[PDB]
Amino acid sequence: SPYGPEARAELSSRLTTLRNTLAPATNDPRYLQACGGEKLNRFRDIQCRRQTAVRADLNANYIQVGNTRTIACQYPLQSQLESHFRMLAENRTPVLAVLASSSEIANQRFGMPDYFRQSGTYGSITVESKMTQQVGLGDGIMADMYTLTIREAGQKTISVPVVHVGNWPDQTAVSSEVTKALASLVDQTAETKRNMYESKGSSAVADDSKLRPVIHCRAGVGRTAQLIGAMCMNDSRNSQLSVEDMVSQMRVQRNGIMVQKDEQLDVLIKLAEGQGRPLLNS
Structure with missing residues (x-):
């Protein structure tokens, strides 16, 4: 009954209203606007909530779902790589989860730079990429998995663990079992890295805007929101947070597209049902 077709239809009803309401108008004051002709949004209709934006020149948002703090973003445009690496470094990023497939990255028509599998130089920043586990x-x-070592003259060198899932197709939902395993790996990778900073006495441990897992696919709304939803359900602090809560929270803090496809919502619903977690708010 609580996960039957009636509840699912009501859940979709509430989220569909929120999605349409959050659709961006032209020059929408709720959404980050391109500065002066330079492309900001990889997809014109998938925009960046202004009040939770991480940097003025990235399509990227601070997201807090219940207690779980993350950053969701689009795959950075080529022009955005320097700012993207600066975001990664300033955040002391404990894990960068990239869900874009290798074939997407390889397709030059899509303009998705291969910024974490190869070393490169972007403005003042030089990035060293090393392969680690699979x-x-x-x-x-x-x-x-990889580590990105981010270097810049006069700046503290930051190494970012990277979890790249290279065969999760766009516009699809991998099974609840695969999602659960991926969420565990991302959470585990971030906890190992966060622990390191804590053992070092990093001032980023006391900063709510820092030490956030960064997650992106191509647009940062589909596979990305599925993973973020799965990660929030692994957080023991989020007892009783509903699926309605978590999807509504992602949408208000990024855009109305978060959890783009029904198959991605269905993964979240199945994971909630496994935990006895409610779909709907009373």
């Missing part, structure tokens, strides 16, 4: 997530889905 972790199977199930159903043949593979997480390839």
Whole structure:
């Protein structure tokens, strides 16, 4: 009954109203606007909530779902790489979860720079990429891991662990089991890195805007929001947070597209049902 078709229809009803309400108008005061002709949004209709924006020149948002703090963003445009690396470094990023497939990255028509699998130089920043483990997530889905070492003259050098799932197709939902395994790996990777900073006495431990996992796919609304939803359900602090809560929270803090496809919502619903977590707010 609480996960039956009636509840699911009501959940979709409430979220569909929120999605349409949050659709961006022209020059919408709720959304970050391109500065002076330079492309900001990878997709014209997938925009960045202004009040939770991380940087004025990125399509990227601070997201807090219940207690779980993350950053969701689009795949950075080529012009945005320097700012993107600065965001990663200032955030002391404990894990960067990239869900864009290798074929997407390879397709030059899509303009998705290969910024974490190769070393490169972007403005004042030089990035060293090293390969580390590879972790199977199930159903043949593979997480390839890396460290990005971000260097800049006069700046503290920051190394960012990277979890790249290279065979999760766009506009699809991998199974609840694969999502659960990926969420565990991302959470685990961030906890190892966060612990390091804590053992070092980093001042970023006391900063709510820092030490946030950064998650992106291509647009930062589909596979990205599925993972963020799964991660928030692994947080023991989020007892009783509903699926309506978590999707509504992602949408108000980024855009109305968060959790783009019904199959992505269905993964979140199945994970909630496994935990006895409510779909609907009373």
